[PDB]
Design a protein around this ligand. Sequence first.
Ligand code: MLC
Length: 440
Amino acid sequence: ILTVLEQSQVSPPPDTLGDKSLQLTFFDFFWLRSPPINNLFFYELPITRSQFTETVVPNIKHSLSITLKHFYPFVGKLVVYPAPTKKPEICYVEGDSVAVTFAECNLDLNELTGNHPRNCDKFYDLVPILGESTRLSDCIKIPLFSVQVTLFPNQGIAIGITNHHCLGDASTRFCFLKAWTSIARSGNNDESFLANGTRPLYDRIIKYPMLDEAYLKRAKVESFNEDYVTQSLAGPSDKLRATFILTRAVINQLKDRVLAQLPTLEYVSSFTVACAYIWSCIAKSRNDKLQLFGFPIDRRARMKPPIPTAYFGNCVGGCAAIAKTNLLIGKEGFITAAKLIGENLHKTLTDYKDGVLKDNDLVSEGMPTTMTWVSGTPKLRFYDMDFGWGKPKKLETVSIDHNGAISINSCKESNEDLEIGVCISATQMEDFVHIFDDGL
Ligand SMILES: CC(C)(COP(=O)(O)OP(=O)(O)OC[C@@H]1O[C@@H](n2cnc3c(N)ncnc32)[C@@H](O)[C@H]1OP(=O)(O)O)[C@H](O)C(=O)NCCC(=O)NCCSC(=O)CC(=O)O
């Protein structure tokens, strides 16, 4: 158990924000029908219930309230209209609030923050539901952001953050969390953020209305209202969650092996080599027929002209590779995976460089028996998010439980090591652990 201590609603301060809209782009419209993103930050601190109630609860409410006045779309809603013409948008109205749940969990915190296999479903009631939609005559309104702060008495605190992808990408979340934590750490005060921090850029500087309508047309907006359903993760399940570590020394040795065997491969990075290694492990674990492995790309810096990091919203692309499973197994399989990822990524980056804006081919060429998409951003350090109690002990992206996805992040006793999160059935996990460890 899970005991809910308070169900609150948090708004920007009185007499700050008026009614505000944010217009969206094809980059945002792409995510119209996506499931929620669920993220957890575990902190170790010997905190009592009385202390949690006396300072943590007020501090979370206050610091968040203040942050919201600078980050209005976080307290806004996604509004989708049934006329295929009128475009979805983010609307904040005075009176809008963020659902913030405060809870207490009696599980041992040490059993959750470890890297070894733990039940995936132990994490679900640490993350808030996105929240009920509001259905009006002219529209549906969907909440964008919710929070759960859970006390582990005498042990620590988990912060559970749920968001709709339409709100923005990992960079957007990073920018918001930077501000919120700065505001919290300095005593519920935004002066350090306003003086030294990075303010979000709401200028609509991505203007491709033809793509806008094509991605919207593809999102099937006229049926969205009738089709939309809540997508909360709930137990029970036999799936296990584990974190696998690639130390910098292992990564470097893997890079070297790729560069020696394939001296003219046009793209090799710590990232591609990490993906190739995990990809190879997944192939050996599955022993299936045909696999696709892919990952998102922050396109801000690759736009022509480049988009500021502080640009608010989505600016994400993608890259995928497909390969027969037998070609991906073993030491040579790792090499092949690196080749395929490196080649596909190089191609995608060149196509961006030369202007290209877009990107059932699977029915024709072959239906993959496994598909894996990477969540996570090793070069954005979510592991440095400090609300006043110190840096996180553990980060978990819970929403990888939903589909074919793994998470890849930095560690944060090291920005140069990689932590790889996997949630898979109990029977498959035993082999996977052996496959991962043995191959290193
Ligand atoms: C495609 C990427 C993953 C590629 O990562 P890389 O680490 O390779 O890229 P980078 O620019 O940081 O480059 C790091 C260094 O440059 C590389 N490098 C550059 N050019 C090269 C070339 N011609 N040959 C070989 N290597 C090259 C290496 O030197 C690498 O070394 P070194 O080994 O030293 O690094 C991308 O940089 C990116 O967009 N990452 C962010 C993705 C993101 O925003 N997340 C999703 C958003 S939200 C979402 O949808 C899901 C979610 O929540 O995550």
